[PDB]
Amino acid sequence: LIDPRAIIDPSARLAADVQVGPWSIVGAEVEIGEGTVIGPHVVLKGPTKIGKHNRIYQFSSVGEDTPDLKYKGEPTRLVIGDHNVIREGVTIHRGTVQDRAETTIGDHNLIMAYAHIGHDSVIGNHCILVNNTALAGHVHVDDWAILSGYTLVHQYCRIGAHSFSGMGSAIGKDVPAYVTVFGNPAEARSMNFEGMRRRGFSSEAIHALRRAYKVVYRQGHTVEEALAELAESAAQFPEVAVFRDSIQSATRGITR
Amino acid sequence: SLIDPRAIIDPSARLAADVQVGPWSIVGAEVEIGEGTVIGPHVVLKGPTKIGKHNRIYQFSSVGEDTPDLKYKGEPTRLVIGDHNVIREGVTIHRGTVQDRAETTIGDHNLIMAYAHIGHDSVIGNHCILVNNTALAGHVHVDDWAILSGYTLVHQYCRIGAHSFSGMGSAIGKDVPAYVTVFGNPAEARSMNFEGMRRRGFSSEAIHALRRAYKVVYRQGHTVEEALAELAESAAQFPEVAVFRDSIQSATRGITR
Amino acid sequence: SLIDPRAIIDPSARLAADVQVGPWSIVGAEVEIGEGTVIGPHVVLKGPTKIGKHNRIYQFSSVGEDTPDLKYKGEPTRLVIGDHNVIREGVTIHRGTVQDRAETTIGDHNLIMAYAHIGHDSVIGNHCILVNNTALAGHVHVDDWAILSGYTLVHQYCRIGAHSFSGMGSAIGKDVPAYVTVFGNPAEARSMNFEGMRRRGFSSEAIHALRRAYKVVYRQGHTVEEALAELAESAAQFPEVAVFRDSIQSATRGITR
Numbered sequence: 001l002i003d004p005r006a007i008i009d010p011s012a013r014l015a016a017d018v019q020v021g022p023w024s025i026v027g028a029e030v031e032i033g034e035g036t037v038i039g040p041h042v043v044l045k046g047p048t049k050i051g052k053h054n055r056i057y058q059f060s061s062v063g064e065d066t067p068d069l070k071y072k073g074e075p076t077r078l079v080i081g082d083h084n085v086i087r088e089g090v091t092i093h094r095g096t097v098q099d100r101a102e103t104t105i106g107d108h109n110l111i112m113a114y115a116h117i118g119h120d121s122v123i124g125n126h127c128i129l130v131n132n133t134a135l136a137g138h139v140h141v142d143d144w145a146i147l148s149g150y151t152l153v154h155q156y157c158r159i160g161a162h163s164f165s166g167m168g169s170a171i172g173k174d175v176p177a178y179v180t181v182f183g184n185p186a187e188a189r190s191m192n193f194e195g196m197r198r199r200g201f202s203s204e205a206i207h208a209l210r211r212a213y214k215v216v217y218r219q220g221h222t223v224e225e226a227l228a229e230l231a232e233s234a235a236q237f238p239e240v241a242v243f244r245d246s247i248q249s250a251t252r253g254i255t256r
Numbered sequence: 257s258l259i260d261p262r263a264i265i266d267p268s269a270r271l272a273a274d275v276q277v278g279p280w281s282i283v284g285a286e287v288e289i290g291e292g293t294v295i296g297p298h299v300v301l302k303g304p305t306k307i308g309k310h311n312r313i314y315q316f317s318s319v320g321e322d323t324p325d326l327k328y329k330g331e332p333t334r335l336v337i338g339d340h341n342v343i344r345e346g347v348t349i350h351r352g353t354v355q356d357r358a359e360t361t362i363g364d365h366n367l368i369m370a371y372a373h374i375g376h377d378s379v380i381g382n383h384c385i386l387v388n389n390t391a392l393a394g395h396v397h398v399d400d401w402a403i404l405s406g407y408t409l410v411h412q413y414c415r416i417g418a419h420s421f422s423g424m425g426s427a428i429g430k431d432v433p434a435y436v437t438v439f440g441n442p443a444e445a446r447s448m449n450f451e452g453m454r455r456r457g458f459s460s461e462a463i464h465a466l467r468r469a470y471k472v473v474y475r476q477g478h479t480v481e482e483a484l485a486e487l488a489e490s491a492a493q494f495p496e497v498a499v500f501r502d503s504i505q506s507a508t509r510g511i512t513r
Numbered sequence: 514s515l516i517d518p519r520a521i522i523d524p525s526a527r528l529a530a531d532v533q534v535g536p537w538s539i540v541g542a543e544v545e546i547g548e549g550t551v552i553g554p555h556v557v558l559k560g561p562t563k564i565g566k567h568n569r570i571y572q573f574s575s576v577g578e579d580t581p582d583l584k585y586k587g588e589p590t591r592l593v594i595g596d597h598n599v600i601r602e603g604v605t606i607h608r609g610t611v612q613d614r615a616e617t618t619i620g621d622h623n624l625i626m627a628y629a630h631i632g633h634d635s636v637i638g639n640h641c642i643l644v645n646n647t648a649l650a651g652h653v654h655v656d657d658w659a660i661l662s663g664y665t666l667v668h669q670y671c672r673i674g675a676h677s678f679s680g681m682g683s684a685i686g687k688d689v690p691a692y693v694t695v696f697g698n699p700a701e702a703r704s705m706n707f708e709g710m711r712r713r714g715f716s717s718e719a720i721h722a723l724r725r726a727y728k729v730v731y732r733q734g735h736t737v738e739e740a741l742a743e744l745a746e747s748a749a750q751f752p753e754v755a756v757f758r759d760s761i762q763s764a765t766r767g768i769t770r
């Protein structure tokens with residue numbers, strides 16, 4: 001299981017069942033959950049906690065210190081969930097004292113080659129981060145978010161549930177749930193109707209959401225004016241309340 | 257000698273004459289490697305994969321991996337690499353998928369630069385250059401002498417025509433015809449790689465037939481069918497224009513405009 | 514020891530006494546590493562190269578490989594890196610070409626983030642910052658205190674001015690004057706890196722001058738000679754303006770507008 005060419009630091013805690021490939025480093029205070037498969041040439045620095053049945057591929061550096069000068073070598077943390085996939089050369093950095101001191105990844109998230117998850121970035125579940133997708137720092141990605149290849153997400157930006165970025169998107173403002181965004185700078189185009197039929201969203205909920213969009217983007221309404229309109233469809237449909245709440249948590253602004 | 261002992265060469269692996277494998281490089285199960293190919297250190301080779309003669313693969317490259325696009329993978333899908341290719345630091349080449357060609361194909365004399373990516377089932381021809389972090393996103397066909405500038409993105413199923421040029425940070429979404437220069441995100445069509453044509457020792461008549469050919473397709477409100485019918489004479493006259501007419505003809509998915 | 518025993522230290526390498534080199538890192542022939550510098554694991558150091566004092570080089574970085582550039586024929590070119598620099602995970606830095614000055618120079622106190630690229634013959638000055646996946650083509654001169662944001666691209670022979678700033682995903686085809694802010698693909702100008710000046714503690718008097726100097730090049734519809742002329746006066750009165758006008762003078766490719 002643990003290849004004899006791996007460096008498993010004394011103060012590790014590799015729960016039994018964990019595979020480590022040759023020439024891989026498991027650093028200080030690195031909890032690796034059970035069922036996991038660490039590939040070869042993988043560096044794990046801590047203090048870090050990895051969940052179960054994850055897979056980390058060759059040349060990935062999970063749990064390093066952000067290079068951000070502001071951060072001054074404090075003993076901060078990173079937490080990955082169960083059933084994730086972390087592809088070749090992905091970098092995932094631990095938190096900062098200037099925020100939550102915990103970088104957090106949830107469950108069932110696919111994180112493709114040379115993706116970056118900067119300090120204090122919080123990822124939900126069932127997400128897809130395509131090759132070279134880069135989360136600046138303090139980035140929240142709610143469940144089922146698909147970010148196309150080479151998507152750049154600016155600091156403190158919240159990516160809504162079931163949202164979708166086009167290839168080479170540069171996201172500066174918050175992406176509401178279900179919304180699709182494209183180009184640099186990113187601009188709202190439509191809802192992610194494919195992503196709704198993936199959940200088996202009722203044709204009413206898809207149609208109620210198709211409306212909920214026009215209210216925000218194509219009816220000349222201020223944000224606060226828009227939230228008031230939705231509140232009844234938000235009250236009736238749980239799905240619309242995800243979309244409604246996603247807007248309401250954008251102090252800085254929504255991607256238009 | 258040529259095989260470094262800190263490397264891991266699986267029993268099934270077939271290493272030909274003059275092959276070098278740097279220290280800590282994995283040559284995986286059912287990886288065939290051809291004459292005088294150099295594998296650097298920190299290279300992962302996963303099979304079933306065929307690598308031809310006199311290739312040079314650099315460190316941190318992951319050649320012949322499975323596409324993550326399918327979470328429950330299929331086997332056996334192939335990666336066929338040809339002869340005299342250069343694959344630079346940290347390149348990622350994925351093998352085919354059973355639901356398409358079931359092979360990723362790379363030809364001869366290609367230059368694939370640092371941290372570039374060739375997605376599953378993508379075909380590459382000869383003398384192609386993929387600049388740093390150029391990314392092909394599955395079932396992509398790249399014909400000969402095609403130059404993709406730094407960080408060019410190619411959408412699923414797009415066709416990169418022969419002698420075509422993409423500007424840096426381009427997001428190609430529709431087919432790129434042979435010779436056509438594309439730029440930006442989404443990629444718009446500007447002109448033709450006249451510089452590339454001249455380097456190939458193309459006749460000035462052929463280059464001027466290709467200049468007048470560009471305008472027929474792009475600049476004169478013709479339908480693709482009208483445009484093709486108009487190129488019939490110039491194409492039969494010049495093999496170089498035929499390659500252009502051919503590339504537009506194969507584009508059912510539409511051409512980059 | 515400080516030299517981890519699973520490292521390769523070529524006989525002809527010159528490592529200072531207190532140098533640290535982590536496991537499975539190559540330190541090849543005619544590679545010089547100065548005092549205090551800390552090499553991480555899985556690093557490839559190729560020469561002829563010279564690394565200064567108190568540097569840090571993270572896992573998977575390949576410092577001193579040949580440019581894959583075809584015009585390079587395998588000459589004895591050099592790479593030189595100064596003191597107090599930080600080179601993050603999977604950075605690629607290439608030695609120079611005889612075609613230019615057979616050397617790639619990085620100065621002191623520069624932070625170069627993960628999967629960033631520094632092409633052949635590229636001169637990086639002091640206290641610069643290259644954010645994740647920033648790619649410099651070749652013959653690129655980045656002067657002191659420059660901040661290129663994540664996934665910024667820079668064409669051949671482009672010269673990034675001092676205290677200048679690019680935005681994330683910027684694509685730079687022309688020169689960035691000193692202090693200017695450049696954004697998008699292609700790169701556009703949008704007044705100057707003011708908070709950058711207010712950070713280092715630039716004079717209130719000079720910031721008004723740089724603001725009125727910016728109005729000349731960009732906003733008064735002068736030709737570059739008409740603007741270079743109208744600047745001379747204000748440019749003689751202030752160093753900051755001279756450095757701005759100097760950066761404008763030395764633009765071989767033209768300036769970003």
Ligand SMILES: C[C@H](NC(=O)CC1CCCCC1)C(=O)Nc1nnn[nH]1
Nearest residue numbers: 130131148149166167391393409410
């Ligand atoms: C789902 C797919 N996502 C990708 O990331 C494709 C990337 C291309 C470059 C190489 C790495 C993969 C996509 O369809 N993106 C898209 N299409 N139109 N606008 N955005």
Ligand SMILES: C[C@H](NC(=O)CC1CCCCC1)C(=O)Nc1nnn[nH]1
Nearest residue numbers: 387405406423424648650666667668
């Ligand atoms: C072929 C070359 N490729 C490059 O990639 C140039 C840089 C090095 C790598 C990082 C991205 C910039 C190029 O110059 N393309 C181009 N010219 N004008 N617009 N695009």
Ligand SMILES: C[C@H](NC(=O)CC1CCCCC1)C(=O)Nc1nnn[nH]1
Nearest residue numbers: 134135136152153644662663680681
């Ligand atoms: C300093 C920061 N640079 C970054 O690189 C932050 C992110 C790192 C990785 C994810 C994508 C960018 C920045 O200035 N961004 C910006 N603001 N306006 N235009 N660009």
